[PDB]
Amino acid sequence: TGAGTPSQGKKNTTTHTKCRRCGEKSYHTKKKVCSSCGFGKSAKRRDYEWQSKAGE
Amino acid sequence: MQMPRRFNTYCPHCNEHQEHEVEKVRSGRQTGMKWIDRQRERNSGIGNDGKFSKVPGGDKPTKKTDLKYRCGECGKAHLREGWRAGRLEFQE
Amino acid sequence: GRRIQGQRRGRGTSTFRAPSHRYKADLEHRKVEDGDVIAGTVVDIEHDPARSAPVAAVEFEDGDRRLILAPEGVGVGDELQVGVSAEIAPGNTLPLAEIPEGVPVCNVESSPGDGGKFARASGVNAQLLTHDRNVAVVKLPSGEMKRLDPQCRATIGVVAGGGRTDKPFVKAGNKHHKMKARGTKWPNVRGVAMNAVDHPFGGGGRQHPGKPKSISRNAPPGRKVGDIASKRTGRGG
């Protein structure tokens, strides 16, 4: 079976959903964690310095 | 080559020709307190130690002469330029 | 290189774990205050999924219902006893001190009250040899002379299910089913059949180990493979 088009058809699983905290569709309903704001993992909001150029 | 243990030659200290005695320079012992000894201790740490991680070099097929010229009267020695010699043996 | 299979094991991931949730009981000797008045009746004989051998269901006078490491020759209705003054017959448990020498024993304790550790698999049994006030020599199934505290409780008889190893699995399917009930990854790929990256014996244009198979005890995990600290190898000599 090809890993391309033929492997795309089984994709009817819901994972990332609207986040109760940040409003982004990144709340992984199976992990119960937001990939965007860290809701469910951190009391603090997810943020990293690499999200922008080092001198900015 | 054969070399006379004693013979007449110029003495740079006395400033006049006199009987000298030839001796092969014996290696003096190290104190282990010179600046280089400390740098070894200081600069050596985790991982490679730079210059201190180097091992001894090779050898030349034949070594130069490492002599000591001892003046007979004043007793003060003096050094000279050595010269490539397979073996050096003294006569008397 | 990549971590070898023996290293993956350590992580205790699903594939390497035993199906504990399917295991029946942690067969351990009972804790009697003293006296030895404790006794019970064999209510049933079950199959132990963890040892591929029978385990006896017993019901004690004090209401307690617990499974047990059943030696051979035990059936429903039989009365088993546990304690210092217990009778000297199969299925009963009492310290090696109160046990007559020359009598085969199983499920022997290492430290008195630990519930039994030695000789617990199909057909095996220890052998109480020497008595004393301090020591009670017991010959374990491996043939080793184990000096033990006379207070160490043990059960009379040979572990049930003897002779299991006599018949061959014959086919892969039978091994499959057994392996599926243990903490073991199976089948087994030979190191010499892998790539250099995967195992110290991997690589080459043909199959053979690189270096000699006997490895020093001091070898680090990732390298300790093949014949571990072998005192010798082969059959001859």
Partner: protein
């Protein structure tokens, strides 16, 4: 004349001799069964406590904290590293155990602020220190002319910023002269070179 305190001080100059020795041998046994952070009604070293700012008053708290002995509990590299940076065994942390103890205590009492701390010994595998914390919100302290300073906002989380005594010392701030070129007014402003 000598104070009674002077005896606790003199006693602790040699924790391995005399009565103090037998006392530690006993105490440590109970201490090893206690938790990481343990609040205690009275300081084991009164002279030291009072000397460090302690007062038998409302809002003043003490707690014994234990930290493991030794170098850094460091994980080896999982990617390319030059030999200089491949170490694990000989790497030590830049904060001293006392400082780690102060932090563990301060975190246990979120509302309190670390006043100071002192050593109370160590066995083969751990060291104990008693930390003195203060309730900056209690009026008993808010009105204390000797301690009210800790009630200021700018003293918030003082231990985490190294503003503690062991902090300032560990930050190489002891000497005002030679040797403190890279430490004062702060390690960070000096490019992190000590």
């Amino acid at each position: 004349a000598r104070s009674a305190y002077s005896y606790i001080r003199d006693a602790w100059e040699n924790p391995g001799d005399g009565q103090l020795a037998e006392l530690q041998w006993q105490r440590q046994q109970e201490w090893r069964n206690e938790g990481a952070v343990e609040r205690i009604e009275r300081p084991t070293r009164l002279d030291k406590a009072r000397s460090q700012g302690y007062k038998a008053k409302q809002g003043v708290i003490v707690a014994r904290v234990s930290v493991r002995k030794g170098s850094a509990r460091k994980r080896r590299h999982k990617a390319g590293r030059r030999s200089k940076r491949q170490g694990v065994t000989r790497i030590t942390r830049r904060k001293d155990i006392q400082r780690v103890a102060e932090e563990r205590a301060s975190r246990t009492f979120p509302n309190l602020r670390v006043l100071n701390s002192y050593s109370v010994g160590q066995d083969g595998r751990q060291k104990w220190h008693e930390v003195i914390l203060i309730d900056p919100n209690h009026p008993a302290i808010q009105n204390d002319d000797d301690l009210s300073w800790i009630c200021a906002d700018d003293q918030a989380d003082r231990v985490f910023r190294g503003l503690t005594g062991a902090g300032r010392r560990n930050r190489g701030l002891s000497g005002k002269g030679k040797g403190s070129e890279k430490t004062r007014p702060s390690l960070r402003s000096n490019g992190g070179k000590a």
